[PDB]
Amino acid sequence: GRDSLIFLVDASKAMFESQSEDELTPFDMSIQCIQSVYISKIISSDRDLLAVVFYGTEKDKNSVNFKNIYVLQELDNPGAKRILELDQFKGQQGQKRFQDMMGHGSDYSLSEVLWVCANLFSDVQFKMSHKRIMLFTNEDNPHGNDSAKASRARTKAGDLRDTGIFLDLMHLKKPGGFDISLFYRDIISIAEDEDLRVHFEESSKLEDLLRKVRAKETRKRALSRLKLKLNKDIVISVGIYNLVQKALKPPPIKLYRETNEPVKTKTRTFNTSTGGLLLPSDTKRSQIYGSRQIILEKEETEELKRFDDPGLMLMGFKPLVLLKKHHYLRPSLFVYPEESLVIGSSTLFSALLIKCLEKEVAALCRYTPRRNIPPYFVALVPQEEELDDQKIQVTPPGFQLVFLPFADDKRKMPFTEKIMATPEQVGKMKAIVEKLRFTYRSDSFENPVLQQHFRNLEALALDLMEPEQAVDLTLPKVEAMNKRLGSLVDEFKELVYPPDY
Amino acid sequence: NKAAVVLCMDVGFTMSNSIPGIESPFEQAKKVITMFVQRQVFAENKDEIALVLFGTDGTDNPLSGGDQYQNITVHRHLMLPDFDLLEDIESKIQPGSQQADFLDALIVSMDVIQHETIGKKFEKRHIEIFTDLSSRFSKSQLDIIIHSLKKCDISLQFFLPFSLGGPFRLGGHGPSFPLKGITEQQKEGLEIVKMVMISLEGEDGLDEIYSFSESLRKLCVFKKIERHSIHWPCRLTIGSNLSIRIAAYKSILQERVKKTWTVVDAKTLKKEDIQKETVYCLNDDDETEVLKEDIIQGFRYGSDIVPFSKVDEEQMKYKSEGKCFSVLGFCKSSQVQRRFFMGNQVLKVFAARDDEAAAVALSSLIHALDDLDMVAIVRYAYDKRANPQVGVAFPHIKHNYECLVYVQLPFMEDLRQYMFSSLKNSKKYAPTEAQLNAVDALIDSMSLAKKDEKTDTLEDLFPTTKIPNPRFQRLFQCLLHRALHPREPLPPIQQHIWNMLNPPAEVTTKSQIPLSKIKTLFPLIEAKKK
Ligand SMILES: O=P(O)(O)O[C@H]1[C@H](OP(=O)(O)O)[C@@H](OP(=O)(O)O)[C@H](OP(=O)(O)O)[C@@H](OP(=O)(O)O)[C@H]1OP(=O)(O)O
């Protein structure tokens, strides 16, 4: 799997005009968004290639030599130099730099722009897995004065979609409101799977459009494709996906001391046990207990962990009330129907989901990830789809896979008698907490270790004077809530705490 | 630290009477002990074990002198368990043709515990009983027995063929032995046991009488011996001025096999002979080895590779402020979706042990959180060298205790935003009304709960969290079988394991028909090519 993306950005007078002073330039939105997606890709350490192209430019630069088209980058993995190049254009000062070096405002035909993009994809060498182009604009009728240009763009888009590209349009907040219906209704890569009357709304906030683009760009990475067995006869195919995954710090790699070449072990040399090498069949597995030794074959070792074929078999249904949330064991997984294997699966899946939601009950299944693995009992919780105000897929429809702890994982609590509190103290705490209420969006807290380490790597790679000490959001704003709290804390303490402590 | 347990088997003639459709209770109790001692041996704990039998044709109690406590043999004194114990219990033990008073066995056991705990720490002492109460007895000394138990602080549990209250598949959930099949000698025995145990453990006492089949699917055998966890002292701070001394414990932790496998020679069965070497070389053509001093730690930055010495790493690595449990704020419990739980453990948070002030403050906090239906977002740092986490703390109230529960929440880096096509708005996938009715009928038939007594309560028919890991039992059984039968192949899974890993037959039987209807109403075919 190795795909690529093209962030095609328009350079027009509207792109540099801010709707309000508090609002930021849509071009600034675009460039900061691109910086965000590059840094995210670097964090994820993915293999996807990327490139950025501008049109509407006073000065062009491209291989095929169309006017007003600037191929600022070729398809490539993200690099620190690229990030600095982008950061050169953020802010009002960067906008001025872009005006001076690039120059904005000029006629163009979208057809030739798409032609340039198609050529740029044609330049690839590796097996390009997907083909995505995302456009950033606030103009809904690019060819309101050139009907021939509009028709040529239409036919080019049709060909390219037939060619295998996907074009996605990230429209921006504009005076009057963007509407894809006018021109792009037949232009965009409308998913044939379903009628995309539902679509993303006009982008106004950097965070909002960032969520939109990040959700749009990536491809589903099916962790596994198992079989959900209702019984020995009824079976359906589902795709287990994980929506959360602890992003560990990427492991270091060894380098040559001088040349800094990526070095390779390319060696797992054996001993004189068999002499230089050793045959795996000569390697029995054993364990020791007391003075006793027990020895098994590797196949025997694989045998005792065999219970059933990989997949999900259903035992029954249980009301969500009986299931607990504090019984967390490991990150939950997500389940979606997969008709690429069995036909008609999604129909049964959807009916079952609807009925489970109606009955407010969850399915209880015996999970088995891969061959010869002891099973866990897992609860399939129905998960109704939810959309944000901006038509954002907040919650994907389908069944949430939840692990259920075994009695071994359950531990006991040593404790003497408990003690309650006076209701006045409870009310004091209620007021205190209300003084600190705050909405929680899951996309709010960054990992300080990752950010600091990547800042260090950036500074080393860019050879900066010093690494930037990234601020931590996780660290409490202690003085801020001290202000927000006032003297309530002291009153509570004197209510509860004794004079000595 | 270290416990000490003794097992009291009934090996009586009445103990071995297999009613068709059910195994002999002697065999079931044999399986129970097999499981328990398997765990003890392969957990290589330090708790010595003792085994005493009653109902044997002979007797070997130290108190057998005086013509009392007959038919009672002390098969094994308090020693650390060994494979010899397993071999004896599976083979050397045979159903005795005698019936004896289990109270005499209790006297022998208390004597053994008193006379063998000398000079040994034994932070815990506990006794198990595997009887059928089918034999009569004398109610004389039981008062002295319970008094001595209270004085010596000895725990106690009872295991019977039938619980207190279709085919009797061993280890099943729903059915049990016919409660009306008991001989009314077992009635009197049950009454005596109930009154003894209620005298011992109070109202919770009657919760420690398990049926053998029920026992096999529970950890109740280890309930009195397991080493409780160790608290993690720390303070949580709201702002600067406010703080509370607390302790926390790991309540959920994925149990893992302790001893991994060791690869040894097929011939000499020696790990010492085998060892592994490696070479380092440049990835470029004409592969030339690279000695370690020409190797420097480096890092990949996308398409970029940067050298980075470990010393520089330590000098530039992020540094926390030490152990801390500070809060950040509060939000709707609705906001914190259950699916966003991350990490690989949970923490129950308690007021620091023996602090009335901390207890009062924490209880007030918990009650406020509950009443407002809020949750707490905290910054959790286990140690100065550990990566700080952010996670939700929410109140968890209970009749006997109250505590906060903490679960690690994820950062943006751990999120993944995949777009999924809806299902409700899919004209090619909308189920028919008849299909929906069939699904509803199934889900009605395939229920696992039941509103009981019309008290609006929901009695589970399948507690999965009470089921332990079947992998440990299977592994222990295979290891023991190999250790006793080296040349023989691995035995298959025991039937009772499949019993405990399956729902009660009632739900399957009731679901047979709706399953067929669904199979008829949902055309499903595979994909052949591609
Ligand atoms: O049987 P349930 O109604 O599902 O209740 C269980 C069970 O308690 P009881 O059988 O005594 O009611 C657990 O006890 P164990 O079987 O693990 O010994 C108990 O654990 P504790 O006694 O240690 O508190 C656990 O409580 P929790 O999961 O909160 O630790 C609790 O479930 P509830 O929390 O619903 O009472």
Numbering used by the authors:
A (entry chain A): 34 to 534
B (entry chain B): 6 to 170, 181 to 545
Task: Quote the original article.
The heterodimer Ku70–Ku80 (Ku) is a central factor of the classical Non-Homologous End-Joining (c-NHEJ) pathway, the predominant DNA Double-Strand Break (DSB) repair pathway in multicellular organisms. It recognizes DSB ends through its ring-shaped structure in a sequence-independent manner. Upon binding to the broken DNA ends, Ku subsequently recruits most of the c-NHEJ factors, including enzymes responsible for end processing (nucleases, kinases and phosphatases), for nucleotide addition (pol X DNA polymerases) and for ligation (the XRCC4/Lig4 complex together with XLF and PAXX co-factors). The metabolite inositol-hexaphosphate (IP6) stimulates c-NHEJ by interacting with the Ku70–Ku80 heterodimer (Ku).
